[PDB]
Symmetry: C5
């Protein structure tokens, strides 16, 4: 005989909802040092991919390439070489903050996690991610002399990129930074939701690539990425300060990101579902 | 290596389409609208991102020697993720629904009043979602302000020029472009049901949506979002130019393209395969 | 875990090809006609999109430097979705049919009268679909018309130039390009018959169609659509240079490319194996 | 309930060797005038894809595009639109020559095919590939009037691509030619290994695309490809000759491709997997 | 009636660690001489892909093209055509030291390999990869005259690129080469993790594609690839020195890669999954 058997991998929509709920749920039943270590590893990963993307962008940000291109090439290159951090953060079993919002709030609305454990888990995750991102920004990004200031305009195509992008991220307004943050985190949550319903290698890679590339080229603001880039911009002595980092950009970035995760995608999805989840709860 | 087959076409894709179509008549009027507004918010997300991405390539000195060639390409290349967000989420856009629920109606699965109410709730909710994302995320962040300069105002000018180009078509031209758009879109919604493969999923929908974007076709929800955010950011267009010159012809076109240009053909070809499938089952 | 596989190629591909050709014999006359017109308008839609993208990359100050490099490249990159459309919905083009139904006739799985019937029906339908879409969505949509300016006439200049370059071949040249085109097309059909997977389908045919587009070969229905819209929009050609000087050669080239270039050899190769398969299906039940 | 079953798309490692030796073993049973038809088809496919690649490159080889860029974009486009030939040959069951050296000499190494039969399969495959390649280069690529010289500066971008690429091929040395040849085959043979280990379509298309795109952009000399391009360049009356095409370049790349197929890689693989193939063959003694 | 099978091509997390440590353990029973053959094969494979990438990147290093882009397209094409070395190595079963560091050390940690076996396995891997890389850098690369100093500036790019690249693979100070090395190895070990835990051919190709491309375009430092690059740059008589080649890059690149493998991706991941593995092996 020669007849094959059918097969399918996109088993989702109303089941990826249950996968999200449980994945967020038993993320709480780990050890404090376990969450700590996963968070620090994810921060290191974000630092790595952001250094890589910055070097590529500053490569395409040459002196005579701006005079015509005007940062079209540089941003496209950054948005092309950044969307790989997701793979290293997922396949190593790590956990980042931006996706913890969606997952863990889903698991809390269903009353599977206690809200104190919610506090513990997500403060640990955010603190660890900051710790890892800044540790990488200093150990492998700054002692590597990559983004330093070479006072000649010919070679400075690396300093001016990490200077311009930073001082552009700073000078938004509170409202603007918040809206860009909510946009970024909605894209991030959607990329996280992809994985639970594709269950396909190419599905994984290409779906999250498209999502994160859209976020990156879009101009939205990610808290972990912002943490890394602004810390390193401070370390290589660009023209921003500490105030414009953890107040004028960072405070808004976290507020809007959490709003997008817990409120924008939280209550609509919880209203659609929670009555499809009931039957799955009834099962033995 | 046992031989596996991750594709079926023709008859079976039609069965899946008609079943997904007659499904949505059983949802409550609340979660249906909830789903519709989420689809709108996602198309707004992706349209905003792709718009700023295309405006990036619309530089003052690039436009001189490329003449908007690269901007439209990056728009088309950045948009097509919206398909993935909606299908994965469990939501629905009115364009996709057209083909689905009209095929069910033809089959005798959805009643008439249920058909009217599903499709109207879908259109209304999608408008709500698009026009609310247009304000709360894109107007407040100020990404499209008329930065009164020549070498910093590309994100405004790209949106301004595309929104102007989208209004000056005469009636029949807007109708025809919308017809083509919905043909593309319903073909993509068909691909998704035909091949149940993540790689095939993302790439089939990406190619379909890219060909739909770069071709100058008119999409009703994307038009809603873009034209609203071009009214907010104070470009050259009159409310009348956006809502009666553009939106009405493109809605005419999208519905017609989904319901009769590709619904009666596909229902006359496979009229009785569905009969037999329901017989022995 | 458990190991799997998708691509079952070689003999299995030939058996699938000959039986997928066989099947078309019994679809009623109305049934093939409908599917024909549908595939025609699909190829028309995708070609319209392709030409619009190409013209977009045909600006005034662009050709003054790069000539036509980006134009043809983006054209060929935008076209390949028509195959996915036709294979997903289940319609047929003449280009796909040549190989399939000749290979089906060779095994005497078909009749000759029904072979003539299915071929004529498919060609008539594809022509009707291509010209209907060329009139109703390309010329009423006034997208290719000649806005007599220089800096915004890309979408008429591109179409004018490709039509002019296609009508200007000697008989043997158009025939040669046509056989090249249909060779690529039926190899793509063989690809989807042997892959049985999603990404395989998509990218396999993408590369095949892109290669036959960028090369400048001659597809008969693509040429129907493009030359008929060029006649509508009134570029600088005539009815001759489309129907007689370009379309008869490409029709004959495509037919012989499907019928004899590949289809006479592969029959000779796997005749014994399909005989074995038929005898085995008769051995079991 | 939901519980998707885990699969594995690649059974690689110590097994692709078994599959490759089995493939090369079974290939040598077909018939005399059957291998002929398969080889002629493979040559036709190589010619088709090389013609498309040449047209694409010459397109991107415009006059002012040369003066700005320096003939870098045309090479990239050629390398991008070449790789389809592998899928053509694979799905149609046809076999090129370069593929055989890595497969059928490995088969013979284990003492599966006789010696005589090995030599005859080699010669039949190469003769058929040659005849098919030059048949396509005459009947579809010369009668097309595509690469015809124009005697004009802004339309000659196809003739110029063909001319200069051939003229850069011919000015090699024997040592240089054989080194470029061995590099190319090493690429081709690893692509064959790819195909016979990774299933699932994307492994069938993308791996081989990347491999032979590297082979194309890298400047490595391919035997069948060189056959096609130099024969058609001669047909079009470029600056190339008959002895700079056949003896000076064609023979060194032929010998180098064979060397890289049967000695560079194929001997170490055999040294590694002797025992694994022995313990594999240890099964059907009493398993059946 | 329609009823496909719910497939799942990817099963990662704890399974990834399980597979990586069992593979790192299994690679230490290889007869003391299969390891060397596989390592030399890996060396020649890296040489293959790096030669091809050098030619590709040099093609975009034109004189005139260089005046505008200034190396943006060169490095991009180089990184775009390098990453096939990963696939070509894994599909045959070779032995790469820089990737062996994580897998091989982890297995050491969990008491699956021993001290002397770990020692000798990785010294074999070192020597074999080096032999393969230098052999390929001489026989096929130096002999095919593709990199000679054709002293006309219009055609010399295939030399200049190589030259220029080597020129700025040396002049870092110590700690700078160490940091770039740490980053590169971290990348390649995560690529190994990817290719191990995502069991699909599609991901097989594309995960490692993105990983190695991002490693390459980022100016990081491999040790096998740097061995090939600097050897062949010596053979052509560019503006470098064997002392700068060895005591200024190789010394720094190998140390940094080893630190990135066995201490920054092997001690964390061993503190994470130390119990999930035990509860699995009994
Ligand atoms: C499933 O694992 C997660 C969970 C959450 C995130 C993640 C992975 O990856 C991000 O970092 C990213 F997608 F934005 C990246 F691309 F930058 F990596 C953001 C994020 O919240
Ligand atoms: C799976 O359900 C549907 C139903 C309908 C649509 C859809 C999904 O995806 C779209 O939204 C889209 F992604 F293709 C867009 F780009 F056009 F927005 C179009 C559309 O109408
Ligand atoms: C699988 O069934 C077929 C049957 C026939 C054809 C086909 C598929 O694919 C085409 O549509 C195409 F994609 F190659 C196009 F570009 F020419 F349109 C042409 C064609 O003959
Ligand atoms: C039957 O399977 C084979 C056998 C051998 C070859 C093949 C497939 O495909 C190639 O033609 C190629 F595509 F890799 C090319 F690019 F080198 F042409 C090389 C080659 O000899
Ligand atoms: C699966 O087996 C391995 C093991 C290790 C590596 C590898 C494969 O692939 C590399 O060779 C590479 F591709 F990343 C290179 F390009 F950097 F060389 C490096 C590396 O560590």
């Amino acid at each position: 005989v020669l007849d094959p058997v059918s097969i399918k991998s996109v088993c989702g929509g109303e089941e990826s909802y249950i996968r999200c709920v449980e994945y967020g749920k038993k993320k709480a039943h780990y050890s404090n040092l376990n969450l700590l270590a996963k968070a620090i590893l994810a921060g290191m990963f974000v630092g790595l991919c952001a250094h890589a993307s910055g070097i590529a962008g500053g490569l395409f940000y040459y002196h005579k390439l701006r005079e015509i291109v005007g940062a079209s090439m540089s941003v496209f290159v950054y948005g092309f070489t950044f969307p790989i951090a997701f793979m290293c953060i997922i396949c190593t079993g790590s956990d980042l903050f931006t996706g913890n919002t969606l997952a863990v709030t889903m698991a809390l609305y269903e009353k599977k996690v206690k809200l104190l454990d919610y506090l513990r888990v997500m403060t640990i995750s955010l603190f660890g991610n900051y710790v890892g991102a800044v540790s990488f920004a200093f150990f492998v990004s700054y002692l590597s002399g990559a983004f330093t200031n070479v006072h000649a305009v010919e070679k400075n195509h690396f300093f001016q990129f990490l200077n311009d992008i930073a001082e552009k991220k700073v000078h938004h307004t509170f409202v603007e930074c918040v809206s860009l943050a909510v946009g970024c985190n909605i894209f991030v949550c959607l990329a996280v939701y992809f994985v639970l319903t594709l269950k396909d290698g190419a599905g994984y890679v290409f779906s999250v690539f498209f999502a994160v590339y859209a976020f990156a080229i879009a101009g939205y603001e990610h808290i972990i990425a912002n943490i890394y880039t602004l810390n390193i911009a401070l370390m290589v002595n660009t023209k921003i300060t500490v105030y414009q980092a953890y107040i004028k950009n960072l405070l808004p970035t976290l507020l809007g990101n959490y709003i997008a995760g817990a409120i924008v995608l939280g209550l609509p999805l919880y209203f659609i579902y929670k009555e499809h989840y009931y039957n799955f709860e009834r099962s033995k």
